[PDB]
Write a protein that binds this ligand. Sequence first.
Ligand SMILES: C[S@@+](CC[C@H](N)C(=O)[O-])C[C@H]1O[C@@H](n2cnc3c(N)ncnc32)[C@H](O)[C@@H]1O
Ligand SMILES: C[S@@+](CC[C@H](N)C(=O)[O-])C[C@H]1O[C@@H](n2cnc3c(N)ncnc32)[C@H](O)[C@@H]1O
Lengths: 387, 387
Amino acid sequence: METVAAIKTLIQQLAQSTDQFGRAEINDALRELQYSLETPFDTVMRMSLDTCQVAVARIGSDLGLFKHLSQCASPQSAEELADHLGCGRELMSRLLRYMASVRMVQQTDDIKYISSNITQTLAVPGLEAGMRHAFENLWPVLMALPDFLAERKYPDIVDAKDTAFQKAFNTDQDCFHWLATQPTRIANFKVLLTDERTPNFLSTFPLEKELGSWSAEPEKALFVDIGGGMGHACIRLREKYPNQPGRVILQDLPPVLQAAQATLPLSGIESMPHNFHTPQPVQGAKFYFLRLILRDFPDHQALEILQNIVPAMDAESRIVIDDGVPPEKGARWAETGTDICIMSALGSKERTQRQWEELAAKAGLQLQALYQYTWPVVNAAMVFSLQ
Amino acid sequence: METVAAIKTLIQQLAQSTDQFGRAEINDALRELQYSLETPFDTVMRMSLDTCQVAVARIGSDLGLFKHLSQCASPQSAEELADHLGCGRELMSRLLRYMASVRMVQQTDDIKYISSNITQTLAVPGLEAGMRHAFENLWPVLMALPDFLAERKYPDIVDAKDTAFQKAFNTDQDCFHWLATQPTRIANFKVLLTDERTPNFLSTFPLEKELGSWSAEPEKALFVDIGGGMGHACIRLREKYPNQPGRVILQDLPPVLQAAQATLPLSGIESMPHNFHTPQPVQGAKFYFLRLILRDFPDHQALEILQNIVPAMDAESRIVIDDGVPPEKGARWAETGTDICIMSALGSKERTQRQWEELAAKAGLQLQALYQYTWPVVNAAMVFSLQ
Ligand SMILES: C[S@@+](CC[C@H](N)C(=O)[O-])C[C@H]1O[C@@H](n2cnc3c(N)ncnc32)[C@H](O)[C@@H]1O
Ligand SMILES: C[S@@+](CC[C@H](N)C(=O)[O-])C[C@H]1O[C@@H](n2cnc3c(N)ncnc32)[C@H](O)[C@@H]1O
């Protein structure tokens, strides 16, 4: 119908007319409209069949389909793709037909296949690794969660060693300890670390305002990236603020620091092995930065991580928690799904602003400023000082 | 956004003005817009988190939350629902926040909870049973598919006894034989059978024109519903054509005929126990009807089912296959996802019109007429005669 074609045109034109945050708001609206207008049968069909996407993405990734199609200059037949990738012809035709129906590839008028936006995404190593993590790590924990909760008469989960994870992978270890003994998972996790989220806190963080008159003299630390992974925050800080003095220090475990060396600048960023369960060695830094760290820990462990930093602080030192700050009400699926997943796997939780302030108060900290940098799903740099 | 409220108003007004087929077209367009507009990170988040929906629906079902909320007259607090249903209060608060974010319930401005469209759907026994089936039968088979295809170097799956199912449930039994040994699963399937799809073939089936001069004496059957389940097709036939002569006969296995009795009219429809893997007892029927039967069998078994019927047929007899008829190209997610699920669990497949005609020719049948009754996902009554 011309009506459907016109709806598509108007929504694309409105999407192009706004920014990434406007487009995120439109996408959530489109989802809310689908759910509101689907029939009861459609609801069950959707819940039944949308689980297919991750499995079929896992297969495409195993075959190298997404990478191959992303490099192809012309439409490919199912036959050409099957013979090239070493797949049964009929299986490849069925997988491609399914993939086209969910835009994981596109199907042409003459029943050939080209890259979509999603083909290209699943071709990117860091994003492919996310999809692989969802299949091998998240799926099993969600599959265990209902019977786990039933067996245990619906407990409030508060312990990383007593959640669905232990049922899912038949172990008494917490997720973090268990992953160390699984080379396949560590390799994928290693690739997942290379994905850099955009935008980042530096888009809205008023660094010069937050600095005040803080002196890098004689030899003080500007920024200590605690569990900084590949040190994207350190790299982006040095890139945005090349003239601000002070040590910029990436802190992580030796294997992650080794992985980071390749892509770290040759000067200006220190690689310091540090376990964030031990006292913070760098004294009187301006910013102690924790990005997507504390959300992976229940309150007891998150508190201990903060308590390990507080004694290193000057009056001018700030702890900067860069993490999810879902609202009190009307939280979006991306903030609320993450909460169920980290409950199931890690025994942890998403925290509202009030819950972040209650946690930080136990560590003797007070919130000075909160700088949101994503919308409508809230990620913010929360700036904490000594009480 | 005023923009988002405006899009919702426009789509809702266009949705209300069209019919169910028009709303299904709009819904498919909103999905495609969503995928096309998505960022690479959104794609991975969606694939990571959308499978939460089934796990959380299953937990809500276990707690009886959806039936409870559907019968509440006023908005309920998380604490009221947790206390009433026997759930940890923090667990219940988090589940409800997640459910509200995906419209499985509605959250009020007061942070209390009411029934949405989806909470009513998940309270309907037949539809709840569809969601439990997705969780306990489909999820494990989709979980097994990628590694099963990898280990076996991407075979064309062709055998019910050799597909993802056997790896998922650690068995050499086919799905149908295995399910029959599992009481809780058998019980869920019987509730699943109580769901009647709408619309149905009688909306576009020109019965009078197909009958022509056909006569019901001596004691001939107008309609034999082979695997008719609750016998909804028999009920609708007798409701729509109450004065058309000829016996109307529900065929299924004894336990399903037993379950059908309470819903069946007192006269006009015979309950005849009959295994459709055995020779058809009713001779010279006008219509031998197979609704959503053959798609659950690979060609070899589907052919055996048809070959059990053909010897009972007159020149006036028709086999009516009422089933999915996906197009040669541009097939929708609801008819390609089904294909991947039935490949994985049953070793079967969706069939294009031409694939149905090829199968039916091997049984000595030729397509007389094809009567579509759903759009844009094709279900049709295909009328076959002896060739
Ligand atoms: C979500 S990942 C990367 C987060 C990083 N801040 C970012 O935003 O790119 C969490 C990081 O914590 C690190 N990590 C885990 N346990 C740690 C520990 N005990 N001490 C220090 N780093 C740790 C991991 O190696 C990983 O790089
Ligand atoms: C998809 S379900 C119901 C389909 C039904 N025609 C309808 O549209 O409602 C398949 C039906 O086949 C029945 N069935 C399964 N195996 C059977 C067999 N060997 N003989 C007869 N009926 C069988 C089941 O009991 C069930 O009612």
